[PDB]
RNA sequence: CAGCGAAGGAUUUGGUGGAUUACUAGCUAAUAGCAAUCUA
């Protein structure tokens, strides 16, 4: 239950730093703020590393074995991570701002540009155990006079070519015996040298500067001593070079400027292969694939990330995120994608597994305040500060409906019908609730009776009663449908922000400004029970303010709460860097999550070092409708916290004779039901999978009819989280058919137990199985046409 | 932008062939996403 | 015994052990290299930060260590190791079996004295290299010439000579010619220390009766004598900043300061270190500086500074006494209890037999701080009792930290040796708290716990009664009386709903906590000594008296595992943070790891000291053990955080031993099965034209499969290559005169989807065929070969409606069951 | 065995509190006399409409029960009896007089039938409420009645109404008062004696429904 | 100098100010004890803040209530509201928060009108 | 007054030291030198 771990970070495909590819360039590693995201672009998936720098990261490299990563932040706190185990190996503090870090091509050394010293360390093994000091220093060279801007290793890991703000570039041999081969310095640029590369044969050296000159250096005679043979110029007048890279094998120089324009050249002849623009913001990063076919560009101001193949002129992806400006989120009615309403005025529909945005919608001319799904993922409603609620078909991607009032107000929250006839929206300057029909477009009603700004709205999903709650310290329940026009006001102790509604519509949980979460019975309007949450809230100290984090009244309350789908838990977040979840029977804190440890954000540290910034805040929390997770719209992105059953041995009434050995003996002796319930009492995912695949098709329905009723949600949620990605489609559908036929009355009379295990199953039937069935159906009908009709002339 | 950035609490940030069209919706590989009534 | 889960990382909390440290000087800064057992540690003397720790543990204890500029020379059992930045550069094996026990380094020479009164000289090869490396000669101090060698020094400007300080004599060797230049007269008492003065050719000798001699090593006389009666002299140091002071260090822990110019005694720092641990073991002035670094055997390293004089004209006669400056320290006695302060594995609480509670940092050793015992004020306003001569609290039996409400109120609850109340502490302030919870039955505190709401603390007395206090306000809330003998374990649920107590009468009581009922009581077969509650999985483990570990869950109150194998009393145990393993340690000098899923012993370590405490980190990072000897905390890292270990039992289905199940490729040949690959490949193939608008071997294998009537290699190549390659191979298939390549592809897809594997890909390959050149198939429809190939493709493909009505049933009934 | 200590000093206050008042902190009884546990509703379909599961100290809960439809199904049935007792033009508003005569009638119910008077009044409700009734199917005014069933809230409503107005007319000009006539009415309705106005009226309504069923 | 706490209890036009401080255990309404609060049939309406939570909460504190306005039943409802939320506020400020929200849970399970009145009315239908 | 109460108790304040981010040493013209010195 409560054992959530940080899974993913949706939104924000790039923040600051350098993009890296893999060696077999399938994944790309992107520095999001202090995490690192890794997007696998072929196997369409994505993860974010769990570890966390304390400032924004500025350098990334992983060796070409793929086996370990090193990430340096913007004051030199390096972190060495095991890339396969996903666990951090060492924390090493270089003392000043490191501009670049690079592993050697042979993997065994890495070097980095810390200030004006090039320092080469040698890589610790991944097979060795963790030591107190795993890095052993090779050397530290100081020949530059100002800060080094770039490294480049040679093809053999033998020379290293560094570029500085000082107007030179230098070549250093790795070992001392080749010191005479590499002792030259390369002058002649008017500005900062942005890059210095070898050719494929390491005979020519190209040095690209900030003003726009690329110099070709050759070991010629005018003795032989590294002349400059040709200077080529970009002649981009106002713009200047922001990032350079070179693929030496395909002779491809890729250059991004401070105007969004990037050009890519075939270098020793200097012929413009292509020139095109990311946008208007500067191109902060260029990176290239190992085969040189993909170019990943990152612009840091809008947080955007291209990877673009330059042969077939086409963008593998275009993915722009939102730093700090995200007002709301909503899970799709199957937990496959999250819709994000963001303050720059747009809707963005992010896939969860593959961490990318599918569609974006810009028809609001101001900050979109709320999104909400309806009609089972077919329609999606959003309300913004420009005065409009509007509806979005997620099939034809059209804004088909726009609802305004008559009073020119700005809407801050909405709520739709279950049977989506009516949308409803509340403002923070009008004290009314606006009730629109969705079929026609008209303003059906204006509900009046709050004496304070309507902070939150929610329709009960079962009996369709409206619950609004406002800053006049009052939650209010409106019976709209069918001749009632009934109003029931429940007073509460302080002013309310974030009401939420149970999945059965029985109760409503409100968050108040005191710091509490009160839970009320709707039909008999009396309080069922409250949680006192203002003492398990982490409220950090800002830098500008002159009052301690203990005595602050800034963020000791929750501005967004949400029920779990079994109705038993509440996740909650606010303008603080803790999100807390509770179980509402016992009113006790299950777990508290620190949403950021970035010291670049403001409200993170409670105690500031006695030796504006974007504050940290969560603006919306939601539980996943299909699989045991929650998304939180922080300032860093959409933090996705999820459990997984691979770890955490948590049995269910095992005894001493219940053992993996006992389970495989019962499987080998083919008591299949006993093996299945032994694996359920182990609650071990590999054992459940092993027994599940070992049961034959002949006796799926006998086992599925004899499964005990306490192990029913376990086998249903297992079949869901297995069958989304497993290939055994007919096996999983046979099991689903046998379970629904044998015990599908228990499910119907215990709806909210199997409310997230059944939504995960019909995330498998309509999303892989129905697509396959559509393909075979179209093949059958094209066959019947192509052989049944007359093609003659 | 500038009047509502100073009238607020929380922080607000601010020819070649193509500007790559980085922001673009409608795409789960949809081509004829029009309505049958629209057609 | 080497392990396969945990590997040794460091032993934290150690600063010194009373080997005389060495000082070294890089440029104008100073470092201080102190021995901690078998490693040394380099400290930055301007701030006492831990720069370096030696990379490997030496095979025995380091016994004499010196430091020139970049290099540190550490002598242990037989040999001298030359270390730079911790990493060992060289190892000088001596040709003896005698233990090397002194050394000096001057010039190209390293001179190492053994304990059989032989001296080994080692020489550099060429005077430009970094350390003395080659053997040169051997010197011997026989019984005629002098006693046991008590020090080995080189006083300056002495061209390749060596002052050897024996117990009675002072010899002077020429170490190039191997000669004994000068042997002094005898000394009437045994001399223990020596230090060269910054005066030219003067050494200072310290005797076992109380006198400092100032021997002039060129005249052969003694210049002056300083008498400190009944004090054995253990250190000598000289001030070198224009103030001629000497600092002697006395093995009753005293540091006495003398003016040599005006022959007075400046000041005495009394009890600067403990006499019982050796007194002041090494004291030295950082040269040119008024700061002196002392170190003692009580695991402590201090600095004292001389402020400038307070009289603006006299100065030299009004010498302000030395004051204290920075210091590092740890426990002076081996720790008795261990806990982790937080889930981040950053701080760990640690209580010792020297009656101190330290908070040690696993990230940076400067952050280690002693929790203060300065009591608060009484709540009413009455007087607090106790002695006026303040001493530390009795040594800590148990403790329990739960930082849910940290900074808010009292946070740690701790139980001391043979006293009837449990103190509280605040980890945020790092100090004691306002409350001492009584037991209310005149019994000593045998266990403590506290809930994870942070509101409640639980005291378990030796007369068998649990008392539940409030941590905020410090008052009795409830009191359960079930046991009659001593309650050794209390814990509570993560939801404050069921508590579990275990006493050494061998009954585990299960109580409801909100209601004050008991849910049950289970009688085991031995007295229970210790409980550990794994709180997420609700499984608690008991160390019984019959040397078993009983793992029992609190939900259904059954013994669910029973782990046998320990040969003596189980000292400690702890759960893995995921709750899969349990690591125990017992008085047979062993540490075992048990996989309680399978119920067997994964790994065992025979460790020479008995491990008295074992704690996992609250993440899966580290194991922390605590042994009988050694003032620190031994730290291990689990290698199973980076690899996966086999849960296969030691003594003295490889996927099921490695907890995996690689899902088999297809379960039955009559079952449809998708590809082992991404699900999106079907959609990419079916719509890759509009996707991009929004953004040969094949022919030879096809022909060879048409010969052999087996297209398995063709279909393997098709399932292998990429969507652009698939479209470009299907789009070029010779659709013109006899139509062979089309019909070979069609009955290849027939042979493919007869096999019920990769069938969504075979379906899209047929869709791509009909899309690319289904117009030529429609054109020469009624052609015999292509019509028969499509006929048998439909013959196999018409058995695909099993999937259709299967997903129709699942969709319709799932919708009906969910909605209605 | 096992015992919990949860007070650690005998509680004494400076204001002296009566011994039965400080005995009332272990169980809530109506008027500190009549226990609410082991008071069951011996007829199902009326449990969840006669409410005896939140014990009270006096029949004067000033809560608001007339602003949703079935919210008066969880007013405690002693207070519903009290509120129905304070109705006519003479005795409107006088809830303290109604509470005082409810206290007197429960005292004399217990002194006549030595059993729990809350159990007696709950049995009187569940025996009085009619289980069938007739509506007048109109046809423009064709005088024909059709038997309908009757919902449990209407059964509890009409039960309290029949009992209270039977006590009024039984106390109309006899020597007995409203408290004594209501006691006789609740006792006879509890045992179901057919000597009460209330269950004679129930038997007439049910018999007419049986007639023109 | 003393830890003290002031709360308010209101029904229609009665209003009751309750001062709670540490003491010996005396509960006094309008100077007279709590066992004199007429109309004597609603004395248990006044008592139920004491009997719902036990007199061991009141064994260490002394309350005084000053009640003006209203009528008989409005004054007993003001008294019980003032006593209840005064005990809650005292255990908030000077005793632990766990006993604070245990008291809030007990009073709210009995009736939350001990802690929150029904104040602004009517409804214009 | 009672009570609390070990060769005393309370309040206030100045200075210094250690933490307030996760520990790979100083200098320079830096593949090494110096640190007693870079200069003939």
UniProtKB/Swiss-Prot annotation, chain B:
It comes from Saccharomyces cerevisiae (strain ATCC 204508 / S288c). It comes from the Eukaryota. This is U3 small nucleolar RNA-associated protein MPP10. Belongs to the MPP10 family. Component of a heterotrimeric complex containing IMP3, IMP4 and MPP10. Interacts with snoRNA U3. Component of the ribosomal small subunit (SSU) processome composed of at least 40 protein subunits and snoRNA U3. Interacts with the SSU processome subunits EMG1, IMP3, IMP4, KRR1, NOC4/UTP19, NOP1, RPS4A, RPS4B, RPS6A, RPS6B, RPS7A, RPS7B, RPS9A, RPS9B, RPS14A, RPS14B, UTP1-UTP18, UTP20-UTP22 and UTP25. Involved in nucleolar processing of pre-18S ribosomal RNA. Required for the early cleavages at sites A0, A1 and A2 during 18S ribosomal pre-RNA processing. It is found in: Nucleus, Nucleolus.
From Swiss-Prot, chain C:
WD repeats lie at residues 22-53, 63-93, 101-140, 150-183, 190-227, 234-269, 277-329, 336-370, 397-436, 445-479, 487-523, 528-563, 565-606, 608-646. InterPro entries: Quinoprotein_ADH-like_sf (IPR011047), SSU_processome_Utp21 (IPR007319), WD40/YVTN_repeat-like_dom_sf (IPR015943), WD40_repeat_CS (IPR019775), WD40_repeat_dom_sf (IPR036322), WD40_rpt (IPR001680). CDD domains: WD40. The keyword Ribonucleoprotein applies. One of its GO terms (cellular component) is Pwp2p-containing subcomplex of 90S preribosome. Keywords: Acetylation, Nucleus, Phosphoprotein, Repeat, Ribonucleoprotein, Ribosome biogenesis, rRNA processing, WD repeat. One of its GO terms (biological process) is rRNA processing. It is found in: Nucleus, Nucleolus. PROSITE patterns: WD_REPEATS_1, WD_REPEATS_2, WD_REPEATS_REGION. Pfam families: Beta-prop_WDR36-Utp21_1st, Beta-prop_WDR36-Utp21_2nd, Utp21. Interacts with snoRNA U3. Interacts with MPP10. Interacts (via WD repeats) with UTP18. Component of the ribosomal small subunit (SSU) processome composed of at least 40 protein subunits and snoRNA U3. Involved in nucleolar processing of pre-18S ribosomal RNA and ribosome assembly. Present with 2020 molecules/cell in log phase SD medium. The WD repeats are grouped into two tandem seven-bladed beta-propeller regions. This is U3 small nucleolar RNA-associated protein 21.
Curated annotation (Swiss-Prot), chain D:
There is a cross-link at residues 33, 191 (Glycyl lysine isopeptide (Lys-Gly) (interchain with G-Cter in ubiquitin)). Belongs to the universal ribosomal protein uS7 family. NCBIfam families: PRK04027.1, uS7_euk_arch. It comes from Saccharomyces cerevisiae (strain ATCC 204508 / S288c) (Baker's yeast). This is Small ribosomal subunit protein uS7. The keyword Cell inner membrane does not apply. Component of the ribosome, a large ribonucleoprotein complex responsible for the synthesis of proteins in the cell. The small ribosomal subunit (SSU) binds messenger RNAs (mRNAs) and translates the encoded message by selecting cognate aminoacyl-transfer RNA (tRNA) molecules. The large subunit (LSU) contains the ribosomal catalytic site termed the peptidyl transferase center (PTC), which catalyzes the formation of peptide bonds, thereby polymerizing the amino acids delivered by tRNAs into a polypeptide chain. One of its GO terms (cellular component) is cytosol. One of its GO terms (molecular function) is mRNA binding. The modification Phosphothreonine is found at residue 15. Keywords: Acetylation, Cytoplasm, Isopeptide bond, Phosphoprotein, Ribonucleoprotein, Ribosomal protein, Ubl conjugation.
UniProtKB/Swiss-Prot annotation, chain E:
GO terms for molecular function: RNA binding; structural constituent of ribosome. It comes from the Eukaryota. Belongs to the universal ribosomal protein uS9 family. The keyword Ribonucleoprotein applies. Component of the ribosome, a large ribonucleoprotein complex responsible for the synthesis of proteins in the cell. The small ribosomal subunit (SSU) binds messenger RNAs (mRNAs) and translates the encoded message by selecting cognate aminoacyl-transfer RNA (tRNA) molecules. The large subunit (LSU) contains the ribosomal catalytic site termed the peptidyl transferase center (PTC), which catalyzes the formation of peptide bonds, thereby polymerizing the amino acids delivered by tRNAs into a polypeptide chain. It comes from Saccharomyces cerevisiae (strain ATCC 204508 / S288c). GO terms for cellular component: 90S preribosome; cytosol; cytosolic small ribosomal subunit. GO terms for biological process: maturation of SSU-rRNA from tricistronic rRNA transcript (SSU-rRNA, 5.8S rRNA, LSU-rRNA); translational initiation. It is found in: Cytoplasm. The modification Phosphoserine is found at residues 32, 59, 74. The modification Phosphothreonine is found at residue 68. Present with 33800 molecules/cell in log phase SD medium. InterPro entries: Ribosomal_Su5_D2-typ_SF, Ribosomal_uS9, Ribosomal_uS9_CS, Ribsml_uS5_D2-typ_fold_subgr. This is Small ribosomal subunit protein uS9A. There is a cross-link at residues 28, 45, 57 (Glycyl lysine isopeptide (Lys-Gly) (interchain with G-Cter in ubiquitin)). The keyword rRNA-binding does not apply. Keywords: Acetylation, Cytoplasm, Isopeptide bond, Phosphoprotein, Ribonucleoprotein, Ribosomal protein, Ubl conjugation.
